[PDB]
Amino acid sequence: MLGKVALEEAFALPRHKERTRWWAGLFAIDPDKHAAEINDITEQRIKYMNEHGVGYTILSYTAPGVQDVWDPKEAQALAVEVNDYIADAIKAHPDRLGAFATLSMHDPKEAAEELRRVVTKYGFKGALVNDTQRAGADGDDMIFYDGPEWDVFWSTVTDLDVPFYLHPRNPTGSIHEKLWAKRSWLIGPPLSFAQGVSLHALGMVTNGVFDRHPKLQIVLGHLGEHIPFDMWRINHWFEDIKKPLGLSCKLTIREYFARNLWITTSGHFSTSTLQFCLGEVGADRILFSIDYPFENFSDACTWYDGLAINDVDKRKIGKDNAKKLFKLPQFYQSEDH
Amino acid sequence: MLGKVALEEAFALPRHKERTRWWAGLFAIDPDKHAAEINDITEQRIKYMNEHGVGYTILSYTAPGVQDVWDPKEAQALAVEVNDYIADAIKAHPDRLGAFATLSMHDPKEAAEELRRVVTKYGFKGALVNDTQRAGADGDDMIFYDGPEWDVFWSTVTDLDVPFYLHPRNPTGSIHEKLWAKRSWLIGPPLSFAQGVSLHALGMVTNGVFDRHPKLQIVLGHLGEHIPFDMWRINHWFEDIKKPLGLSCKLTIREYFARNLWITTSGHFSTSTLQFCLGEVGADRILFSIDYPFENFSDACTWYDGLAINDVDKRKIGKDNAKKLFKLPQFYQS
Amino acid sequence: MLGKVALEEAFALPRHKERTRWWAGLFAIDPDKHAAEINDITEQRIKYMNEHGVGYTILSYTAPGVQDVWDPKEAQALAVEVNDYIADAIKAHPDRLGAFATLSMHDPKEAAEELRRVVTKYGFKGALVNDTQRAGADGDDMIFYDGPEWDVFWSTVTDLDVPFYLHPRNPTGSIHEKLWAKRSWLIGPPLSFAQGVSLHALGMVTNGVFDRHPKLQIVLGHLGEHIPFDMWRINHWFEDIKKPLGLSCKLTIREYFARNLWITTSGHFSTSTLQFCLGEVGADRILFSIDYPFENFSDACTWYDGLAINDVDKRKIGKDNAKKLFKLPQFYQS
Amino acid sequence: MLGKVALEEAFALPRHGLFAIDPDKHAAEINDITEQRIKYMNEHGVGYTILSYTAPGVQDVWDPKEAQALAVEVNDYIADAIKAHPDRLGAFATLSMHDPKEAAEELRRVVTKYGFKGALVNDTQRAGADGDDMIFYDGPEWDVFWSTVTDLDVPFYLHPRNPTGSIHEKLWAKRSWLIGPPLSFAQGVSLHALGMVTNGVFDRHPKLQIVLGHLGEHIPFDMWRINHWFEDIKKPLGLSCKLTIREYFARNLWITTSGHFSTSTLQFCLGEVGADRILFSIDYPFENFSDACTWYDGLAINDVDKRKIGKDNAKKLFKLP
Ligand SMILES: O=C(O)c1cc(O)ccc1O
Ligand SMILES: O=C(O)c1cc(O)ccc1O
Ligand SMILES: O=C(O)c1cc(O)ccc1O
Ligand SMILES: [Zn+2]
Ligand SMILES: [Zn+2]
């Protein structure tokens, strides 16, 4: 299928080339090719899109990104640097590339202003944030975004009417735990097995962020970070246990999934799991995505192009859902192969 | 869920009660209750709708219905009687009851005329025809509607822009004698029903009805009369072998399911089969239905109300798809 | 995965040049390659097995085969000639090739003796029959095997304790003339093949073949010839309606599928439909198969080898289930 | 279906306060072994349940002598408490997992003296001055324990445990209503179970049987991602474990239906895991019998898998009457 859209697609800053290529060696083989790909915006990356039937991708700053930076002043500047960087690097190809805002999430009103700056001036499609914001004098605390003081940020998000993509971040736990994770081949991307996004997304639900922002759109990767697998358990926990003891979120977990959540196929090229999510989530709330360059175009689009599912859902998931959700340009698919 | 729409819902003529009750002895454990309920239009029927969250039912004449009458003049008269009867019986409840045309399918242009008549004058939502039309001196020939001589009928169908519901009919005469009579517990829902419809629907597909009438909307009950089970197999054999050897229908089987066919959950309350069809067919083209009174409201609506599937699709298959397909006003229910 | 077993694999008699080229022209875009593949037993066939991870295939006579032959003597002659031919032809590779008996089904005891003769002297794994036996002087009759008069045959099958593979057949005679000739692109894999097997197999259920012969194992190809799609629907109508009204088979349809029935993946390389059958049927009763040469090895085994399913079932469906059912010895890559 | 087997069923020491809706039924039910528990087993078609000590239990006790003592206390107590009903009640060993050779000894003792069905351990063992450390069991020093486990040929049930504290993280979780069981959403079992694979526990102990609750703590949902991680990224980078994740799930792991009564998810797991490795379980008393067994009795799935998951798999795995 031609004209696909992907939106968990990462880039890094050229001035970090050496930091970046170091981390690439601890992730996958061929770190030279992956480091070059995650720095490239307009050459191989678009070549890959042409060869694999992808009309358009939305780019995001690679994790941990700004959410790893605990000094507020330094985090804000990096967000501005990154946003100005990527807006400029993609300007010539509006039919192939959009960008999500990178943000400092230290202060609710600083974050809302920077989203407004770059959405208004650059036409960014939303925000991609790598879970909680590291904070504290030496980064030992974290900032959650579901408290009442974040209402001002979510109202900016719905006012701009752009979605918010909640991407994983390497968990910051014990010394013993990180060393065990590294020695056990279980740490890092694309797996992100230790991720806290699924818990944090349930927090936004239980703390009413979607009751106060019923039009808010949050996007989850990895086909929903296993939440659809626990839909029954989560429903049971709300309706039968927690709501009876005081939990006041107005709707059911399935109603929030119908109004406020989206899942992408980032790094999850599973026909069986996708078909399972047709039941638990539905084709109308599922977005194709690759997680390039941690995943390669070929694995993602070979899989998706070959999906033996009904035509309407295959188009909705492959491109027509994102085309509307991210207000893609009409005739964007006339610039491919 | 409230406001569900069901549209494979049967009624019979009161003057036919005697034989209506006989026939039921074979398909209902309590044929007296079946005849009372299949004869009733506005009392037990809508009370069942009120207690089981069904806002709207589109009613259709019970099978075999007109397709059992092989004399053309007698068949045509029954269709007219049935159509005028039902338009009048449901007139006091336009927010709860709708009707499909009943038709004699002996003559393509007679059928088109009576379809246009009743859609225009009574506002019927489409046609419900019970598979092939019995014909011949002793009613042992069969009329399929996939031949070119039916083009004039389909053009009226697409001209009105109403769907056509392709309903099973019991097997009869020689076909009945050769295959079913010696294993007749398979007659009806068990196997014979879906064997007939799928033959007929796939005939329309492979003989180009949907190519000549691309706006035609055909609805199949019982989650598609087996066809989705073999979507992969049919597609593979159409696309990789039969089309290379002469099959000339223009689209893939999957594309017809995306633009010309609809499936309902009539008499098939199977969560796992429904979930399988979420993939093979898609939620946008599945409609709730019951098959009342062969099935009862409580089995169908208890099953449906309880589906632990995503709410968007639950809303679509339970009512929204039918509201759009048949253009129903926006009622909400008690 | 290595060591796969496939068991709906056809071969033809080399003397039947017309019949082979004719059937091949309706089922392949390259009928010349199909005729060579369906005639070869030991060269191309074993090359494909080596290249695609298939340790063992059980061979069967191509359809329609003996079930197309309405002269009882001529059909018995053909069946005996086929069984003697394939026993010699696979003799050099008993670690890679097995065979099902080909039988004339005009007489239960005649068939019973031929199955006993070839299972006992040649080591046949069971019988594969192409649906109903064409009978009558003008070949318009069809013989089903679900009546009690076949008990003497089904008891031979259970005494030998080998399965019976019920393969489709093209529709013939009046049925073919009335239903299929005018939509004849539905003949074979698209619809007609599963309509006849399902009718017949559900006949064995409803007419008590599995009640009288409870140890009998019947194998259906093509993931069950539509039947699993209707497990729920068939179950509901048997248990709630037809049984109270007289159907007397003693188990549920699910129990027959648990105790007596098997489905294969022949010609149905559909991940989604397989996933559905894992629930409705269970991996313990699902066997890999290809339908070679109508299907090619590469399509069947790229699909199977690439299935992202749990390893226990992948091994059971791919070789372990067949290794137990057909009592296979330690064969190539087993 | 009658004769069902459930094996994630918890009990507490009577000597040990209010946590759920109508909490009185929960405290009485989790202390009861032979009265409340067996009457429900009769009412809902459950022939046999294997009992286990409530989380976090011993894994929360970081003092080695105090942990060993409670474990021996708990084992000796439940073995006597269920003595009268051995055709209905079974038990998993409670263990201090501070010392592999000491844990192996206590597992051996109670399997040998009391006929326990295996071990149930609540994820990692709290350890170190003040309990700021945890013990993992996948290193070579635990081979002596796993060989004891495989020699006794009993399964090992890896149960969740209250996650690592962080003050803000604990407060945020407990104001956000996402804290505690039966959800235990921040479980570490998924990560640790996968560790046993990547650190070679199943390579060094090919016969070890590990059981996971909550239908596998989402590992089945991520089976494609984990397989792809092993075979296409980590193995080519240097990971040396000998089999694929699916092969380990086929040979060494089990999932139960504890606290996860979802027909659609179960059917999802027939594909990802398979009926031969799924065991019914309830999570009593955190879950109640009627929700668990009303769900299971009503499953419209093929007959063989229903009897395998309901009792037949547990009867063979646990070598039951
Ligand atoms: O640990 C993670 O979840 C992670 C995810 C990424 O996409 C990039 C770097 C990471 O460390
Ligand atoms: O986040 C980490 O500390 C990390 C460390 C590694 O050695 C390899 C990958 C990682 O993601
Ligand atoms: O379900 C049945 O047995 C049935 C029988 C008929 O004659 C007509 C329609 C039906 O639905
Ligand atoms: Zn990414
Ligand atoms: Zn009907």
Q: Which residue has the tokens 């998924």?
A: D190
- Output b/e per residue, B236-275; b: 16+ Cβ within 10 A: bbbeebbbeeebebebbbbebbbbbbbbbbbbbbbbbbbb
Per-chain residues with Cβ under 5 A from ion ligand 5: B 8, 291
Q: Which of C3, C1, C4 is nearest to C266 (CA)?
A: C4
Q: Which two tokens stand for residue C117?
A: 């003769």
Contact C8, C264 (CB under 8 A): yes
Q: Which two tokens stand for residue B162?
A: 């109403």
**Nearest CA owner, ligand 3 atom 3:** B27
Q: List alpha helices for chain A, DSSP H.
A: 17-25, 31-39, 44-51, 72-90, 108-122, 151-160, 175-183, 197-206, 209-212, 222-225, 231-236, 253-259, 271-280, 297-305, 311-315, 321-325
- Output b/e per residue, C28-44; b: 16+ Cβ within 10 A: beebeebbebbbbbeee
Provide DSSP, A14-38: GGGHHHHHHHHHTTSS-HHHHHHHH
Residue A301: active-site member = no
- Distance in angstroms (rounded) separating the CA atoms of residues A299 and A303: 6
Nearest chain D alpha carbon to B308: D264
Strand bridging mode B4-11 / B127-130 = unpaired
* All chains having 3 or more CB pairs closer than 8 angstroms to chain C: A, B, D
Contacts 24+ apart (CB under 8 A), D175-181: D175/A207, D176/A146, D176/A202, D176/A203, D176/A206, D176/A207, D177/A206, D177/A242, D177/A247, D178/A199, D178/A202, D178/A203, D178/A206, D180/D19, D181/D55, D181/D286
What is the CATH classification number for the domain harbouring C147? 3.20.20.140
- Distance in angstroms (rounded) separating the CA atoms of residues B317 and B325: 11
* Cβ count near D207 (within 10 Å): 13
Contact B158, B91 (CB under 8 A): no
CA geometry: angle at C105 spanning C100 and C111, to 5°?
Answer: 65
Q: Which residue has the tokens 């920077």?
A: A114
**Phi and psi angles of residue B140, each rounded to the nearest 5 degrees, phi first:** -105, 5
Q: Which two tokens stand for residue C125?
A: 């794994």
- Distance in angstroms (rounded) separating the CA atoms of residues B77 and B80: 5
Element (H, E) at C131: none
Element (H, E) at B262: strand B261-264
User: Given CA atoms C249, C251, C252, C255 in this order, what sign does their dihedral have?
Assistant: negative
Q: Which of D305, D292, D317 is nearest to D214 (CA)?
A: D292
End-to-end CA distance of chain B: 11
- Distance in angstroms (rounded) separating the CA atoms of residues B286 and B317: 5
- Distance in angstroms (rounded) separating the CA atoms of residues B229 and B41: 35
Q: Which of A172, A99, A101 is nearest to A133 (CA)?
A: A172
Cβ contacts (< 8 Å) between A308 and chain C: which residues? 270-272
Q: Which two tokens stand for residue C224?
A: 């069950």
- Distance in angstroms (rounded) separating the CA atoms of residues C75 and C68: 8
Residue A101 has what DSSP assignment? B
Q: Which two tokens stand for residue A75?
A: 């985090």
End-to-end CA distance of chain C: 11
- Distance in angstroms (rounded) separating the CA atoms of residues A295 and A297: 7
Q: Is the bond leading into D206 cis (omega within 30 degrees of zero)? A: no
- Distance in angstroms (rounded) separating the CA atoms of residues B325 and A138: 61
Q: List alpha helices for D273-320, DSSP H.
A: 289-297, 303-307, 313-317
CA geometry: angle at D100 spanning D99 and D103, to 5°?
Answer: 85
Q: List the 248-287 stretch of B: residues with Cβ below 8 A of A.
A: 254-255, 257-258, 275, 278-285
Bridge partners, residue D92, by sequence: D118
User: Given CA atoms D94, D99, D100, D104 in this order, what sign does their dihedral have?
Assistant: negative
Contact B324, B283 (CB under 8 A): no
**Phi and psi angles of residue A55, each rounded to the nearest 5 degrees, phi first:** -80, -30
Within 8 A by CB and 6+ apart from C188, the residues are B237, C26, C27, C168, C170
Task: List ligand 3's pocket residues with C-beta within 6 A.
Answer: B 27, 62-64, 170, 188-189, 291, 294
Among A128, A129, A130, the mutation site with the greatest number of ligand 1 atoms within 8 A of its Cβ is A130
What region, left, alpha or beta, does residue C169 occupy, with left being phi > 0 and alpha being psi -120 to 50 degrees?
beta
Q: Is the bond leading into A189 cis (omega within 30 degrees of zero)? A: no
Subunit contact D303:C278, Cβ cutoff 8 A: no
Within 8 A by CB and 6+ apart from C154, the residues are C145, C209, C212, C213, C216
Residue A329 has what DSSP assignment? P
Contact C99, C59 (CB under 8 A): yes
Domain that holds residue A261: 1-337
Subunit contact A309:B255, Cβ cutoff 8 A: no
Q: Which of C151, C149, C60 is nearest to C103 (CA)?
A: C60
Residue A214 has what DSSP assignment? T
Q: Which two tokens stand for residue C220?
A: 């259906």
Q: Count of domains in chain C?
A: 1
Contact D276, D286 (CB under 8 A): no
Provide DSSP, B43-81: SHHHHHHHHTTEEEEEEEEPSSGGGG--SHHHHHHHHHH
- Distance in angstroms (rounded) separating the CA atoms of residues A310 and B282: 6
Element (H, E) at D248: helix D245-251
Torsion of CA B128, B130, B132, B133, to 10 degrees: -90
Provide DSSP, A170-206: -----HHHHHHHHHTT--STTT-TT--HHHHHHHHHH
Subunit contact A313:B280, Cβ cutoff 8 A: no
- Distance in angstroms (rounded) separating the CA atoms of residues C71 and B205: 37
**Phi and psi angles of residue C257, each rounded to the nearest 5 degrees, phi first:** -65, -30
Within 8 A by CB and 6+ apart from D312, the residues are none
Q: Which residue has the tokens 């929204």?
A: B320
Residue A318 has what DSSP assignment? I
CA geometry: angle at B215 spanning B210 and B220, to 5°?
Answer: 65
Q: Which residue has the tokens 């095997």?
A: C145
Contact D195, D135 (CB under 8 A): no
Contact B134, B69 (CB under 8 A): yes
CA geometry: angle at D302 spanning D299 and D304, to 5°?
Answer: 110
Strand bridging mode A164-167 / A218-220 = parallel
* Cβ count near D271 (within 10 Å): 26
What resolution in angstrom units was achieved for this structure?
A: 2.5
- Distance in angstroms (rounded) separating the CA atoms of residues B118 and B99: 10
